[PDB]
Amino acid sequence: PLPKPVLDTNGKELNPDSSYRIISIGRGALGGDVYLGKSPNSDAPCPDGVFRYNSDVGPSGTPVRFIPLSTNIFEDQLLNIQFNIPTVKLCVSYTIWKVGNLNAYFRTMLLETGGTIGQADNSYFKIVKSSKIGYNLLSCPFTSIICLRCPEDQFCAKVGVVIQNGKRRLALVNENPLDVLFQEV
Amino acid sequence: PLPKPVLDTNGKELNPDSSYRIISIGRGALGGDVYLGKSPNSDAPCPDGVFRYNSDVGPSGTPVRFIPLSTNIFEDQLLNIQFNIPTVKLCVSYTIWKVGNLNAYFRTMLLETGGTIGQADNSYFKIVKSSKIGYNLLSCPFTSIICLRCPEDQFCAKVGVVIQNGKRRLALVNENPLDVLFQEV
Asked: Which UniProt keywords apply (chains A, B) (predicted)?
């Protein structure tokens, strides 16, 4: 059993030195790239929400970069995700992806920025092959806590979308994971 | 396979109509009952921390009551826990047990009050037989989220103690679960 690499839209394995737009399998109105947006009800001084657009006919996504434990980006392995964009002095800390506190209204955790690299908190994700088409993102929060009899004592969950203030907000879901591709820039 | 009931210190199955002190297997200085205390750094207007005393030679614990989905309190089944004590008008809401947000310093979630009954949030626990002596409490937060390939798609973890401001604070742990007994009142 050897670790499978993750590929971009062009077949080339994923570079930790490269940046990628996270684009959806879905087309037109069922499409829209992942981007960094302002959560309607956040008190953060920076944009701290991970959203996707409502249609793929408009702005492109905010590019990201992946940070493996390793030197290689493989499927089903813990990694960090980080928006790769210039930022005001104030907001330089709000680019690393993480999963937030339990949101009672949505009954799940939402994806936000303000995470940290290489630490056993809420900032670890995985890339895996989707059951339908393409790739899924997984969130594995609480790597510091033993999940009893779970795969490698580890709580993991699929990443999807909820609608928050009429925008597509990425969040942990049970069904309809966001099927995505990675388009190098 | 039939569901096993949980017993008090006297053998009698646990009543939802009764109250119990949660007492430790450990004796003297390795002992101390669970109680409702004030978290040093909480902004709650009420006491909202689940602690245990430093020694069993002192005050007794704060009594609790258990609220099964069922009508019966069995091992390995989701239930709510609630301190059974009179309260000021202001604090009547802070008696139901729940697990808090991820605490970065302790790298785990701490046990607090302010939970809710019969809802798929952070307020569900389990009673199970300890691996060493007696019973363990389990926290199963996020019952609304599918834990991938986990026992019944469910993240659960053992309840132990961290030391916070020199007090024993109950919290999710990996080793040394708090071994407890239930002493009816």
From this structure: Disulfide bond, Protease inhibitor, Serine protease inhibitor, Signal
